[model samples]
Structures are given as C-alpha cells and as structure tokens.
Target chain A: MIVKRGDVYFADLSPVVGSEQGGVRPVLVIQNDIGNRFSPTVIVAAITAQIQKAKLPTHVEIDAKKYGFERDSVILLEQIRTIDKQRLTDKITHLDEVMMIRVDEALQISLGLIDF
Target chain B: MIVKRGDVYFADLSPVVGSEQGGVRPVLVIQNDIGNRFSPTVIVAAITAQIQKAKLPTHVEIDAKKYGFERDSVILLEQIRTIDKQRLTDKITHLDEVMMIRVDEALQISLGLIDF
Candidate 1:
C-alpha cells in the first residue's frame, strides 16, 4: 500500500480503546511520504461527517463532493492515530496542495505547536 | 507568570469539548523555552495517574514520587493542548534532563514526527 500525505483511505479501527475513534471509517494520511514509505505504521487523522466541528482550529473542512466523500467531512486533527498499513484499504482520494495547507495548520494547532 | 519547558503546573482545562482532557489537571510544559517566554499560550501534555498506559509509545512514564505527584503518573502526549498562561497556576515540579529526553521522544511519536 503506497500511502501518501493527504491521501484518504478506508480504514479498520476495530476494537475501540479509550477515547480514540473506532470502527471502519475514512482516515486521512497525515504522515510525510518518507515515513509512509519507510515505517510499518502510518499516522492518520480520522475523518468524520461532522461538519459543525469545522469551526474549531483542531478541525479542517474539506468539500465532500470534491473529495469524493458522500457527505460533508471534517478532518479530526485531535484524533490522530498511528496504525499499521494493513489497517488501510482503498484509496478514496487525495487532497490538493491548497487543502493540504489547511491540514498542516490544523495539525500544528492540534499538536499545540503554535499559539493559536 | 513565568513558564518554562520541563515545568509541571496545575492547569485549567475547563469546559471540555470533544475528546480533549478536561478539568483541572497537572500538565507538563513541552514547548521550547523561547515559546514559553514569548508566546501567550504554552504547549503542554496532560498528565494522568493512569500509569497502566505507560506501555504505549504515546505515553511516557514519570516517577511520581520524585516529580511531587501524589501517585504514579504518565504523560498523555496525545492529549497535547495549548492554553493561555493564565490557565496555569502553581508550579508542581520539573522533570530532569534525562526524563525530558524520554518525554521528547514520546511526544515525537505521538505527533508522528518519527517512525517508532
């Protein structure tokens, strides 16, 4: 599986544990290409149809139709997780560079790397 | 209101929303000295007495007794938050250089900066 940054894929997040997102859902590949190629596990943020959350700095809104999502979707930067590549299947779509810029900003906020 | 990297302080994570850790809790300052000094907000990882979670790469175990914690504690690197300096009060303790090295590593793993 060649997972690249900004690529969306259907993933199996089975056996819910703690507050982490569970169940098979779409996840955005957030790790850089180098890690995606070299690492056994890929880092991702679970995507949800919860668009209302787009107001928060920890969330980024992407046009559902443009991204091939059925409903409006928001990337949950706060719910970042690292899972083995085996958990990912089927590339849904990839975000453009402009959208990736928003993702990078939201990620920085979620990780508290910036003041905002 | 001087805060520094490696300092632990009681922070107000009040009115929690989403899956973020809430309420008053001890948080370990993870931002650099420059940010802590210049930024209005500080980056920190919530600390918890849930020592059982120390096994995960995203969690870092800290010696509670040495750190002035009432019980065994673990740093939840995944629960990083940026809050105003006003939210922080009462310096609890500071982690030494060696321990902070581990904290830095765990933080990198939690943020997916390094392939662990």
Candidate 2:
C-alpha cells in the first residue's frame, strides 16, 4: 500500500485511554513523503463527523464530498499522532493541493510553527 | 493577576523562529486552575482572526462578541503551549460552559486522550 500526504485512510487508533482521541476512523496522513516511504509508522490527524460540535479553526473541516465521509468532518489537528502502517485498513480519499496547503498552514499553527 | 481556564488573554508569544507559531496574540488559558494558581507558566491555545483560513476540526471557533475580539477567531488546539504568566498581557473574556466543554473535548482529542 502506497501512502502519501493528504491521503485519508480508515485507521485503527485503538488503545486510547481517558479523553484521548482514538478509534478506527478516517485519518489524514500528515507525514512527509520521505517518512511515509521508510517508516513503519506514519503521523496523521483524526477526523470526526461532529462538525457542529465545535468551531475551532485548528480543526480543519473536510467536505464529505471530498473525502466520502457521511457528513462534514473536522480533522483534529491536535489529535495528530504516529501510527503503524498496518493500522491503515482502507484508503478513503486524497485531499487536493489547496486543502493540503490549508492542512499545512493549520499544522504550522497547531504545532506552533507560525505565529497567530 | 488571577488566571483561569477558558479565560482569553492577550499573550506575547514572541521569540518565534521560522514557521513557529509566535507573535503577540490572544491565547485561551487552558491550564488547570491548580497549575494557574501556583505555576509561573500556563498552557494556552492560540486564537486567530483568520477563521476561514482552514476548516480543520481541531480548530475551535469563537465568537468575537463573546470574547471581545475584534473579529471571530479560532483557537488552534494543536498550538497549546505553556508560557510565563507575564506573557499574558490582558484579559479578554472567559468561555461559557458549553464552549468550554467544546474546548475541553477538542483538547482531549488533540492530546489523544480519547479515541475517534
């Protein structure tokens, strides 16, 4: 399975404890191509269908039409993590460059790489 | 100056390197009260006026009216960080319970405390 940045995959983010974000769901591969090619684990952000749950900018919203999600979901950039390649059960969609730029900008913000 | 969670403050998140989220801006005090009471530092999520910049779910939106911000801003949950209390220059407003719950939920997600 060839994984690349901005690709959405159904990932098993299990063993989550307490309020930690986990479970089997859509995840955006945020890891760079180099890492994805070599590392057994890839970093990704979790996506959720709770569009109306909150309106934080850090949570990048995804159009269901774009990613084939049931409804509009937000990628919890704060929920970004590294997971093994085996956990990616299915490939759902790939984000376009525009959206990928958004993701990158958001990551900069989330990771404190860019000033507010 | 007493600080509490959900409280919005004008923070000087300066000394940022390239791509690092820095500069003076409004930050949501997400640190626990216990920590806020004693520690010289507090954790906060950066808030930005560029609400439409992206639609990631990890970013929580805030009403300008509620927080006294000039424009609506999204709290970058992934940008959560600990800074000295002195960095917080002014108090903007505090988040209501509902919004606080949303922030907390996002934090849990960002911190990987809960599964998707």
Candidate 3:
C-alpha cells in the first residue's frame, strides 16, 4: 500500500484509555510520504461525521461525498494519533491540496502552535 | 485567586469521556498571566507523578520537592486542557522561570510546532 499525506484510510483505533478517540474509524494521514513509507507507524487525525464540530478552529469540514460518504465529516486536529501501518484496513480517498493546507492550519490552532 | 502561567494548582477535572486526565489533579497553568486573570477559563497542562515519562520530548521533569510534592512529577504537554477558573480548588506552587521555559519548549515539540 502506498501511504502518503492527504490520503484517507480506515484505521483501527481500538483500546480506548482516556479521551482519545477509539474504535475503527476513517483517519486522515498527516505524516509525510517518506515517513509513511519508511516508518512502521503513521500519524493521522481522526475523522468524524459530526458536522457541528466544524465551528471550532481545530476542526476542518470536508465534503463527505468526496470520500464516498453519505454525510459530511470533519477532521479532528486535536485528536492526533499514531497507529501501526498494519492498522490501516483500506485506503479510502485523498484530500485535495487546498484542503490539506486548511488541515495544517487547523492543526496549528489545535496543537497550540498558534496562540490566541 | 491570582492565576498566572507556571503556577501549579489543584483543579477539578471531572466528567472525562475519553483519554483526558480527570478528577482532582495538579495542573500547571500555561496561559499567559493577563489571559489567566481576565479569561473565565485558563489553559493548563496536567502533571503526573510518573517520572519514567521524562524521556519523552513532550514531558518536562520537575522537582517535586520544590512544590512540596513527595514524589517526582512530570508536566504532560500533550494533555493540554482548558478549564473554568472556578475549577481551581487551590494554588499549590509556581514553577521556576528556567523550568517554565523548558515547559514551553516541550509544548512546542508536542504541538507539532517543531517538526522532528
């Protein structure tokens, strides 16, 4: 599987411990292509169908139909998670470059990289 | 109730749904002094007594005795949270300026402001 940034994949996010999102869900690959290919683990931001979350600076709303989904979805920047490459069940789709930039901006806000 | 950055306080972190740190725990305020004073909520990083976590770039080890803690403590930058000012039950202590700088550096690493 060719893993790269901007690709969406179904991931196994089981074994919830705390406030971390768990269970199998669609996650957006955030790690660069080199790291995604070379490293055993890949970094991702969990996606949710909760469109109401789009109001937060940390959430980026994306067209669900673009990814073959019926409802709208949002990428959750605050819930960054690292999962083994094997944990990725299937590659869903790719996010456009423009949206990826928005994702990065949202990540900055969520991670406190940009101050309020 | 003089809240400020670098100050450690006992806070009520209840109603945790996922992996968020909850219950009454010692948290290090990370928001600036002005924001801490004026805002109804303050940003903080949870503190854990687990000294082994010091190896991570996201964790900053601090002297427990300096804050009257019996055991060693490490500030958890990955678990940044915002809470109402009223949630602060008691002010425990303040981290030194040098260590606070370390905390800020660790936060940058954790928040992906500084790429590896």
Candidate 4:
C-alpha cells in the first residue's frame, strides 16, 4: 500500500504466497526520503531480525534499483499465499487502490493502491 | 486490532450497520492511559474531524464515564450495517478475539480481539 500526499510517499509491499511456496508470511516494504540514507543490505538485515523474533517464517528480498532512488529504496518482500484468499481480498478492497501483478520472476505481488 | 502489554489497554469499537440502517460505515474508538488527561468531548471531536476529511459518512458518540478515569474515555461509534456480511465476517476471523455482541440498544458491535 502506498500512501502519498504531495511529495511524501509510504509504500507497503505484501506478497501473496504462490502455489510453489510452502509457508505464509507478509513482507512489508517501506520507501521514503529515508531510503536515500540507508543501504538495501542493511534494511533487509533489520527486517530479517524482526521476523525472526516474531517466529514467522519469512524471507526478505531488497531491490534498490527499482524505485530510482539516488541511494536505495529497500524492498522487503514476503510470501503470504497460504492465507485465505477471501480474507486477503477483503483487506485489499478496503484500501483505495489494489493490484495483483505478476513480477518478472512470476512472483505475484499484491500492490496496495493508495493516495494521500 | 488491539495491541496490548501489561498496563496498556486499547479498545477499537467498529460497529456493523444493522439491517435497520440504510448505510454502512466503520467506527474506531480508542482508549488508553492518556484518557485521564483528555476530555471525552475533545477526543470525539478529533475523531469526527478525521472521519469527515475522509469523506466517510459517520457519526461520533462519546462516553466519558466509561473508563473510570479522572477525565473520561471517548467512545467514537459509527454505523456500518450496510457492508457485505461475508466481508465483515472474514475480517473478524483474521484477528485473535472477535465477538458478536448485542448491545443494550440492540446494536451489534464486532470487536477485534488481540493480544500483546
């Protein structure tokens, strides 16, 4: 989900678990002005640590070049395909914008559409 | 969803619109230790403004004496009977604690159950 007003933007990326994946987990990706101040590796490491504490089986993949950030925007991706589709659909509908997109690698990314 | 620890209590009241009502909307009520520092009226006003800006048709009612503080906890209520029951039911099931209750007024409050 991306919340944007003027120049401010907050992006939350939560991926649905695909048929190939065995577990359900949500990856939260955040991008903002602070993205320019952090490294993709550092961000992924922090996210992995947090997920470990929660005992939720999750893996973090960061794409720094995707957002055209001068520094790097960390993309935290997770797999949540095991969740009930109806429940996932409900949450996606509550928000302003939602898209089910197929990534280059065939990973389905449930991008939350949002506005300020 | 209520995220709680040892001494903190967070209550979120989201009322489903009854069959008697013609519209659907959600109510979000919050209470915390800070309740003792603010008047019920003030808190309600703040929430009202927020709901209005979102262009969501909503009503706010506050109950100051409910929380038993030096001041009072604000209860922000809204009617959401018009939404799809299946959708609402799915949301209630995702959280930890969900109860369908009959209020004195016969209003149904779908309380989100959560733990720390």
Candidate 5:
C-alpha cells in the first residue's frame, strides 16, 4: 500500500479502454498521507529523462546523480493524474523536499486548484 | 470527432473508479495528427487559471486576455493524458505555434521521446 508522500513507484498505467499513455512506468505519488491511506486512488505524476522535452516552465529537470537516476529526469507536470494505488508497485526513491515543493506549486497552477 | 493538434476543448475528466481529478475542464490536444484521427483516445493537458500552481518548469502560464480567457490560464504539463473523443466537448482555443512548440519540446523530454 502507499505509505508516504513523494515516493516514486513502478505503476501500471495501462488503460483498458482507450490508447492513452500506458505501460508500467515510474510515477511519483503526490498525495498526502491521510489521503494516501484511505483513498482508492492516489495522485501521481509521470517522470522521464529525454533531451529537452517540452521546455522551460513546462517540465521540471531532475539531476540523475542527485535523484538516483541513471540520467537526468524531467517531471511531466502536464501528465499529472490520480491513479489507483494498486497500480503503484515497488517503491523508488523519495523525491527531495525542494523538488516536491515545486511539484506542489505546479499542481496548483496546472490543476487550477487555486488562484493567485 | 478528434481533429487537428493544438486545439483546446472542454473535456470530461471524471474518473470511473478512483479519487482522481474529475469534472469537465479545458484540455489541450498534444497528440500527433495521425493519432488524433484514428486513435480512440486523444492525449491532452489540463488548463487552469490558478496562481502559483506548480512552479519553475512544471506549468506554463497563458495570458488570459491574449488567449481569450477571463483570467490568465496555465498549461498543466504534469496533468497530460489521453481521453476518449467523447470526453472532448466544445472548442476553446487553438494554442499558438510558439506555445505548441514549447509544449512539443517539453513532451519530447518529459515523455522520454528522445535523449539530449
């Protein structure tokens, strides 16, 4: 079960109906602890390490060396979604506080959870 | 029916089984033309007008007046996903070329479509 926040896990992102983004990939759990415990679904974001994906203000760059990735990783803020907690598999590294702060900040703006 | 790329539309983001973000909202079409045409699912990113949502490389801000929104909107890079064509409703606005360019650029990296 999901036990903490900011933990990365291998997720079953496969969609049964349509051809949305699928396959088991790494996803960062962004939900809080209480919510993580009871909620059947947990909000998570996809991560990648491709050269210059979208660009500034769209993706967050993560240092491979610093974050335990073989190469740099970029957080796909646009790809955030609430996924089934069952989809979360083996736990990966916990993201840094500062980086998660950035993630939370992006969620607000991107999800329109709040206004400035 | 699914049409060209970069077109914004209202979408049903409701989750069938979990606490994932739901409700109808504006989404940007980021998938390629071919995919948009034949595929049952079309990839899109959530758009909002919240303040300080995820920051620094997580969300892209859009000008409200310029883009025809009452308030400035944000492109949620982390919230991208594919939804059924049925989920897409009325047309909103077509994102600008430069912005679409940046969105494509970020996707390449965030989606791990390429390596630098």
Candidate 6:
C-alpha cells in the first residue's frame, strides 16, 4: 500500500548490523511520517534494495547520506532511541564521523545518483 | 508470542484500521503495551487463532464483543490516528461507546484475563 503522512511504519533496515566501539548494533528506523515531513522510508528502502541486490548484508553505519546516511543519520536518529540503549549507544557514539564521510560518498557513487 | 497491552506489536489489527477512520487505515495497532494492558495480546491472539482457524486475517473489528473492542477501542484510538487524517478520523470519532466497553471486556476474559 502507498503509505501517506501520519502513517506509522517500521522499516526493517535489518542486516545493517555493524561493529564499532567494541560491539555490534542493528541499524533500523521506526518512522511516523507525521506529515509529508520527509520520505525517510523511500531513502531507506532504496538503499536496502541495493544492499540486497548485491547479495551482501549492508553492515556499515556511515555518518553521511549515501549508505551510511540512511543507516546512521535517519534510522539511528529516529528508531534507535526506542531500542534497548545498551545494544547500540556505545557503537553509535564511537562511529568515525570523519571516515564515514568518505564511506558515504563512495556508497552513493556505487548506488547511483541520489535521485532514487 | 504473548503481548501485553502496553507492550508494542503490529497487531495485524489491519482489517479494523479502516472503516472506523471513514477510510481503511488497516486495523493494526502498533502498541507499546507500556507496562501491561491486561495482556491484550493473549486476548487478541486467542481470538485471531479462532478466526484464522476458520481462515481469515481475522477480519471484523467488532464493537465490544467476541471481536470488536480491540479493533474499536485500543487499536483505533491509538495507531489509526497515526495514519492519514482522512483515513480514520470519522470512524474513530464516531464509534458507539457501549460497543467498545463489551469489546474491552471480552478481550480481557478471552486473553485469560491479565496476571503479571
């Protein structure tokens, strides 16, 4: 179905499990599109579809938009708060912001333009 | 799995999501079951089992009966509002008060009446 504003949905951004800060965390986001505020799901689903197509589990949480952007910026910022803190707080805090920039850019290039 | 009222679940309250909203928002309630809602899940599952046993997504968001309350009261009052404004505004706002009470009661007794 075409989900609209104010709709609450869970994005199974699973498989984006990553290791940082001496632990692994599952990256996902539970979004409530309060309005047409932003299509976080479109951004998330597109990235995940690519990850699936490549036959690889998207396992990195980049700090920028491309792959990491979806994993870190949106998902973590939103849904991670609802999860048990012990499972992700440390790794999220330990993410390398500087290196993540490069990683995010590369992922975008690999995934094609940001239009999707 | 067992789910209490405050505990979160996408109760597939799907069928009920709509109609109550004027449109059909899908009757699934994304519950947090905060502490414990008298174990709404046990009640919901038991009813759904019988419905499914008869082969159904367990349709019919009843009005305070063998299967009306959850679809009317909890799920409708909670999650349905999160969908589109037009989708569920009316049904939720228009529900008959008495139907819901029976629904709540049956849900309790069916789920083996909450404990912990």
iRMSD per model?
9.5, 12.8, 7.7, 19.7, 10.1, 20.5
lDDT by residue (tens digit), candidate 2, A26-83: 9898766655675566667888886556464456887767656778788876566556
Worst 10 residues of 1 chain A by lDDT: A13-22
Per-residue lDDT of candidate 2, residues B9-99 (tens digit): 9986654323335678888877656556755666677787874664654568887676566777888765655566767787988888788
Q: What shift in Å separates residue A111 of candidate 1 from its native position after superposition?
A: 0.4
Candidate 5, true inter-chain contacts retained: 0.23
Residue range B49-108, candidate 4, lDDT tens digits = 122332211222322343222332222222211111122111111111121111101111
Q: Of the candidates numbered 3 and 6, which has the greater lDDT value?
A: 3
Return the candidate ranking by TM-score, descending.
1, 3, 5, 2, 6, 4
Measured over all alpha carbons after superposition, the RMSD of each candidate to the real structure, in angstroms, is 8.5, 14.4, 6.5, 18.6, 10.6, 18.5
Alpha-carbon DockQ of candidate 3: 0.09
Residue-level lDDT tens digits of model 6 in A11-36: 22222212101113333322222211
Whole-model lDDT for model 4 versus the true structure?
A: 0.19
Number of residue pairs clashing in candidate 5, backbone atoms closer than 3 angstroms, sequence gap of 3 or more or interchain: 31
Docking class of 4: incorrect
Cα deviation at A104, candidate 2, in Å, is 0.8
If chain B of candidate 4 is superposed on the true chain B, what is its TM-score? 0.18
Please give the range of 10 consecutive residues that has the lowest summed lDDT in model 5 chain B: B107-116
For model 4, which pairs clash? A17-A80, A17-A81, A97-A113, B17-B80, B17-B81, B25-B80, B97-B113
lDDT of 5 by residue, B23-47 (tens): 6778888755655665566667778
Chain B TM-score for candidate 3: 0.90
Chain A only: give the TM-score of model 3. 0.91
Model 6 agreement with the true structure over B10-100: per-residue lDDT tens digits: 2222322112222232233222232113211111111221222221111224434433244432332211212211222222222243543
Q: Can you give the lDDT of residue B24 in candidate 1?
A: 86
Stretches of candidate 2 exceeding 4 Å from the true structure: B1-116
Highest DockQ model number? 5
